Amino acid sequence: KSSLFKIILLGDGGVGKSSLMNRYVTNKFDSQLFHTIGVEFLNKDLEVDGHFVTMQIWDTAGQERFRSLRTPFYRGSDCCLLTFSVDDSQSFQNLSNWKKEFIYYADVKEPESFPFVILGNKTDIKERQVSTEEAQAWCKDNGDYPYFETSAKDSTNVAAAFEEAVRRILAT
Ligand SMILES: Nc1nc2c(ncn2[C@@H]2O[C@H](COP(=O)(O)OP(=O)(O)NP(=O)(O)O)[C@@H](O)[C@H]2O)c(=O)[nH]1
Ligand SMILES: [Mg+2]
């Protein structure tokens, strides 16, 4: 890694990737966001351990039709925020596919230990389709990844999630 910590968000369309980035960077939420087409990135600088970090967050299209727009920018990522929505079972069932897509196109230095952090977003929705138990189980079984239940809407665990991504990058 260079000093610029590259954190990339991947996950199905509608799961809340753009909202998560926008909540963390600008502390805003929009109930009417449109689908992402080309990738977007934003810088964010702060202290995590009480130590100075410069990150660049890369937001990508979740929709299959835009795969070719996002895959060129996987390379050089330091951590991947694999995102699903707790109200969307298919988004969770697709996690393994997303991990495989990342690894294939990222060509990272050693794929076995690459840092993923898993976000089950929209935790504010009580009518969930995905259980915390099964999500925790997937994280354990597929690399013992950190798991966060998040809400871009009410801010729950959004900063926690990005802060953990930084903690997973630091050791390299
Ligand atoms: N209730 C709730 N809605 C959320 C949350 N995060 C995002 N949303 C909503 O879900 C919809 C999709 O959000 P968006 O951030 O655009 O999703 P995306 O993952 O970026 N989609 P794409 O990959 O197609 O760009 C929007 O209507 C947004 O307001 C959340 O935590 N809670
Ligand atoms: Mg988006």
Side-chain angles (χ1 to χ4, degrees), residues 1-108 111 113-126 128-172:
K1 49 154 161 45
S2 67
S3 50
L4 191 57
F5 287 13
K6 181 175 169 177
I7 296 166
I8 191 161
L9 290 141
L10 294 191
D12 282 10
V15 302
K17 297 178 299 300
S18 305
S19 302
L20 285 160
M21 179 178 69
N22 290 347
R23 169 62 75 191
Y24 189 53
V25 177
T26 64
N27 200 52
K28 300 184 182 180
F29 178 75
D30 196 327
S31 62
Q32 306 291 119
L33 273 199
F34 301 128
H35 291 287
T36 302
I37 300 160
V39 300
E40 297 287 346
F41 57 88
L42 289 175
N43 288 345
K44 185 163 174 79
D45 307 324
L46 43 57
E47 298 191 336
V48 175
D49 100 348
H51 169 262
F52 188 61
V53 182
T54 57
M55 80 174 61
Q56 192 176 68
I57 299 156
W58 288 66
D59 183 21
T60 66
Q63 289 186 341
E64 193 156 19
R65 56 167 163 162
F66 303 131
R67 176 175 297 124
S68 78
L69 301 190
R70 61 175 185 259
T71 59
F73 303 107
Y74 291 8
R75 191 179 191 278
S77 293
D78 295 299
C79 183
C80 177
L81 291 174
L82 232 172
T83 308
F84 70 96
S85 170
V86 303
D87 80 331
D88 178 351
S89 174
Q90 184 62 256
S91 70
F92 175 70
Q93 293 169 184
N94 284 334
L95 291 180
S96 287
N97 184 263
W98 280 113
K99 174 174 169 180
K100 290 172 176 179
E101 189 183 292
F102 180 77
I103 291 303
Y104 181 75
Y105 290 102
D107 195 35
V108 300
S113 82
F114 184 82
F116 289 85
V117 174
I118 314 307
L119 311 192
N121 190 226
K122 309 206 189 178
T123 204
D124 57 285
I125 299 175
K126 299 292 171 293
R128 55 195 296 130
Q129 293 189 358
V130 183
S131 86
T132 302
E133 177 194 339
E134 73 187 329
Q136 288 169 341
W138 187 93
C139 293
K140 181 182 176 175
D141 294 348
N142 288 277
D144 197 22
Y145 303 135
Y147 176 59
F148 294 89
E149 297 251 343
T150 67
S151 177
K153 184 177 177 176
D154 68 35
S155 85
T156 309
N157 290 326
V158 176
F162 281 94
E163 289 165 17
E164 183 59 23
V166 174
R167 294 193 194 97
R168 298 285 160 173
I169 297 167
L170 278 166
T172 294

